[PDB]
Amino acid sequence: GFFVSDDFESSSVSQQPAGWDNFVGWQSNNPNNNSGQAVYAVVDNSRAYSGSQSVHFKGGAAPAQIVKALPQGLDRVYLKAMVYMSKKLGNEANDNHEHIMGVRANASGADNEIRFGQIKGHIGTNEVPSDDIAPPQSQWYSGPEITANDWHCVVVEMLALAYHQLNAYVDGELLHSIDAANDWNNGGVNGNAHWLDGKFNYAFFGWHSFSNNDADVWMDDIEMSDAPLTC
Amino acid sequence: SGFFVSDDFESSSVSQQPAGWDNFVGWQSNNPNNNSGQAVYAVVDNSRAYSGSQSVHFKGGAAPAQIVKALPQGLDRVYLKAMVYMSKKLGNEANDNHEHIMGVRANASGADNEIRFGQIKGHIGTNEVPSDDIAPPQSQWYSGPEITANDWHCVVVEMLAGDLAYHQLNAYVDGELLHSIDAANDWNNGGVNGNAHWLDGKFNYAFFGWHSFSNNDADVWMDDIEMSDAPLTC
Amino acid sequence: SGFFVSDDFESSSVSQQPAGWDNFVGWQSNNPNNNSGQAVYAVVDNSRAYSGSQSVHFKGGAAPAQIVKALPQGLDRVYLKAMVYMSKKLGNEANDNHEHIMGVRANASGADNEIRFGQIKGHIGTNEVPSDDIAPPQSQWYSGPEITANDWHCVVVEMLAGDLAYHQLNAYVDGELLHSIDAANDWNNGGVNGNAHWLDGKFNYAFFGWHSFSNNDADVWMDDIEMSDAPLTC
Ligand SMILES: [Ca+2]
Ligand SMILES: [Ca+2]
Ligand SMILES: [Ca+2]
């Protein structure tokens, strides 16, 4: 059923992209989301993958994200974006966690969500409110890199099944998967095998760091769907 | 049940209609003039192949070029599989009407009662006649994944009737699910006129080749064609 | 008094045959040439795992890639368990002859005296050799449940001999019973040439890996393998 795409060609430069809500500076639908602020998510022609327009996120400790509501009753979600980042993800000393993409239950907070990006310097996933992280600690501060300053196609597949799954592809290669309790470091989201329940109300993209890293991220050619996407 | 048939085209004599198949060529069932001296045709070729030295080559367009085989009676499902090499892409194409490489029909005599898999409106997808419904819906037209031109692709179409409340179609290309039907709202124009059991009566013939309703001429080669009432995979 | 062994493959060196296992690779018992440079092999791998960092990877096909462990003498019953990740499915598939992931054999030297669990004629099931009986019966071929490809599945096979009038096999995947033998008529040809005690002599070795008699090459990973004369858990 469900499909949405956005190449950002329809939006006006310097504005919040048409059709999207925001999570900017810790506020849902921050009235003050513009490029004159220090944190923002706006259409740019500064750079793009398709056409002349992409979205530009400037954020850090404070999140800069666009948000879209998802229809009720989804059994799976695929999120796909072309992504260009001022810093790399993965194989990174002294990272706590940082994320570019995810799904959340309630628009008003960042406290109940699945966050895809890196955890402990490996590509991976943080679930809140449990604050579990995957993969487990044997793998931290290593593994594959999403390089800075090049366009990457990122696909996250989330399937909700006896154990809910997540798979994250970059440039076609599978860099991260969750398929059992033991893929979480701290036991598996406090014992919940159906850990994506309640999570599929919103999809979000942009940048949020809990490692105090300020970043510019551009994204383009976003898709979400309840059927497989690929690059 | 247990139905399975395979053809690698290795046994057939070059430049002839593959042995064992009927045709639908130039709008005629078992056209008697199916060779390379016509404008549309379906013949064994040794110039390109996936398996061995031989494939079937289809040249057609607005006029269909197709090989056809009857099915057993009483099938609850059909799987069709082919290695496919196309002179033009399917999918993500401006201003397409619809074009198909593969499908099933009720009556060999015409092309007016069938399920056609290929693209509709420039998205990989499915056309049912005579309702003329198409899927997916308009919000996805002229976009989505491609079956690229000028490369070998494994194509699998799965059509499930049986005891399903809603009949299903799934099309895999090179392992990846590119197109699915599982509810009335997968159709653009309602839902094959309200028929949840939309594959009923359709499983009499299976056909392969090329037929465009966008007036696009094409060369398709196919090889390692398979048909079955149990799953096929690449 | 009982018997329990498990292997999570965490102790073993990557690219080596797992520590403490024998092999049956390329139709040779304890093939000295078992590494990732050969076309067929069974080795510890770190690119994929269920538990920890390590699992065992089999690459094989027509030629078997298996790890083998002796079982103690005197057993009345055997449970095998593996976490299994396959590059192709088992069950519900057109045109299969038979393929197996798991089993027990009477002697290490050969593949000719054994119980083979996997699929038979495209249903999940069991082949006994040398009788070549297969279960379930023909009624059920090319259908039924699947072990899907490209996911981790817990496979438990229970084989009960002992004082049963008719020896039994039960195969669970992810908790669901997918295959059962408890009478002569569960076999297509009436039960291993009239032998009600068809596991007799079979419990000398357990093996795990891949072997196809349908000419399908595959990559399998397995992990958390257990054997026991008592029930096993997922
Ligand atoms: Ca764009
Ligand atoms: Ca051929
Ligand atoms: Ca392990």
Residue numbers in the entry:
A (entry chain C): 3 to 162, 165 to 235
B (entry chain A), C (entry chain B): 2 to 235
Task: Give sentences from the paper.
We therefore set out to characterize two previously unstudied proteins from the shipworm symbiont Teredinibacter turnerae that were initially identified by the presence of carbohydrate binding domains appended to uncharacterized domains with probable redox functions. One of these was TERTU_3803, which contained both a CBM10 and a CBM2 domain attached to a range of distinct modules (via flexible linkers) that did not bare any sequence similarity with catalytic domains typically found within carbohydrate-active enzymes. Using a ‘module walking’ approach, we searched for other genes coding for these X-domains. This led to the identification of TERTU_2913, which lacks CBMs but contains predicted X122, X183 and X132 domains. Taken together, these sequence analyses suggested that TERTU_3803 and TERTU_2913 could have a role to play in cellulose metabolism, and furthermore that role is likely to be a redox one given the presence of cytochrome domains within their linear amino acid sequences.
In addition to our work on Ttpf08450-X173, we produced TtX122A and TtX122B, representing the X122 domains from TERTU_3803 and TERTU_2913, respectively. With the structure of TtX122A in hand, the structure of TtX122B could be solved to 2.2 Å via molecular replacement using a single protomer of TtX122A as an initial search model. Three molecules of TtX122B were present in the asymmetric unit, with chain B’s electron density most readily traced allowing modelling of residues 2 to 235 without breaks in the chain. We were unable to detect any fluorescence in the tissue from the X122A:GFP or X122B:GFP fusion protein alone and only a weak signal was observed for the CBM10-X122A:GFP protein.
